[model samples]
Target chain A: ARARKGALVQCDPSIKALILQIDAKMSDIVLEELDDTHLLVNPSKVEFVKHELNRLLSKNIYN
Target chain B: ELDRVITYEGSLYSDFETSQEYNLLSKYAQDIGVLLWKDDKKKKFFISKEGNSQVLDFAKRK
Candidate 1:
């Protein structure tokens, strides 16, 4: 009966875990955590999420 | 009904919501029993797949 809008992000579980961490730091970024691999996030924060993901991902790289 | 919903992404969401197209689409969808969802941030929106074809058609005409 009620409808709300959000951005759907699908990724591997490990990546989703990282996103969870990001969301933890910025509570407003996620609207809902849908299952293991899907997240519904604030649409306006999509770029911020991607930027944070890249930052987190690059930190784990060996090279 | 909720399970069949489709999310609009990127600028498509923004464009559609800002344009008058959304009003017409929303009115049509309501008449047909489909729910239209809008983001609190005003940056996105979505509609049920049952009315998705109409959305696409409207977008195509733009």
Candidate 2:
């Protein structure tokens, strides 16, 4: 599990929801928001994450 | 919950709810060992991708 999710949530709530939503879409992935900012997100596949990020764009996210 | 070791060189990591694990990265895990054997059984841990992420502070542990 990646901890960055917690870190980002701590930094910004909007980011946390976006990430959390993506996580849900990715699969039944559990995300833990640690502290105010640090979070545990994904582990193992870094490249695939890049692909996922692409879908986050304005059109893709809404479309 | 389902338990699976979904293994792949970042291939499986298509989309992340948070961020990618920094420790899993070969370049990141080269020398620094991310060990948590005792807790590994119950508690799960993954490396944070944030560059600002700090070293494991046992103090940070508690």
Candidate 3:
């Protein structure tokens, strides 16, 4: 299965206001998309994300 | 079972007993508190809220 992930590492903490707005909008979408048949995400995705994060952490050291 | 998202600091599949292929499906069931019962003969899954946590009967799942 394809792993799903998203991020904004390029942006600094000064963008907290914008990030909060995006967070709110994301929450709205999540609530709307969640249902019996259609689930926005499952816990397994966390494993996928973790794998990706590990790669990022490694890349940061040398890339 | 239902699938709701939970923010995590690390990998989710790490907690899965089986392979990643079924982890997505299994975690969703777990999140909704739906226990899974597999049928030995048919190899099917039962996402149930009640009853014994038994195997998935092909007739019961499909």
Candidate 4:
């Protein structure tokens, strides 16, 4: 089995806040929200979150 | 690259109900590197369809 690993990323406040907003609905892929709006995300969906946040940040170019 | 586009109209986004439902489009777009433009007021999104057969098929499913 490919044992899943984890990581802690100090995401930007807006991105982390978005994660926290969405966090309320996650059951299996949970993340620990920090006091500064950063977070600790783990496992399979980690890559998804990483890229997702980048995509979200890209929106800043226009806005 | 900007030639192909597919429009999706429904509750897949906008409604922030569940993580599974709320983040469907953005998650898939990020995973695949597709350009997704959403109009929440219109409840629609335009996705780049180039090399995105799976998204087209999936969107058509709903």
Per-model tally of clashing residue pairs? 0, 19, 6, 0
| Better by lDDT, candidate 4 or 3 | 4
Worst 10 residues of 4 chain A by lDDT: A1-10
Per-model TM-score of chain B: 0.43, 0.18, 0.31, 0.40
For every candidate, what share of the true interface contacts is present? 0.07, 0.00, 0.00, 0.00
Best by DockQ: 1
RMSD of 3: 15.4
**i-RMS, each model, one decimal:** 11.1, 15.0, 13.7, 16.7
Which CAPRI level is candidate 4?
incorrect
Error of 2 at B44 (Å): 13
lDDT by residue (A1-63, candidate 1, tens digit) is 124556666677787787788888888987776556556778888878777777766676674
Q: Could you tell me how far off, in angstroms, the CA of residue B43 lies in candidate 3 after the best superposition?
A: 39
Chain B fold agreement for model 2, TM-score? 0.18
Candidates 3 and 4 compared: the better one by TM-score is 4
Instruction: Write the residue-wise lDDT of candidate 4 on A29-53 in tens digits.
Output: 4444433533445545566655555
Candidates in order have lDDT scores of 0.59, 0.34, 0.31, 0.44
lDDT of 4 at B5: 14
| CA lDDT, candidate 3, residue A3 | 16
- Candidate 1 vs 4: which has more DockQ: 1
Candidate 3 per-residue lDDT, tens place, A1-63, comes to: 121222112122322233234436444322112122222223334344334444544576666
How would the candidate models be sorted by lDDT, starting from the highest?
1, 4, 2, 3
User: Per-residue lDDT for B22 in model 1?
Assistant: 59
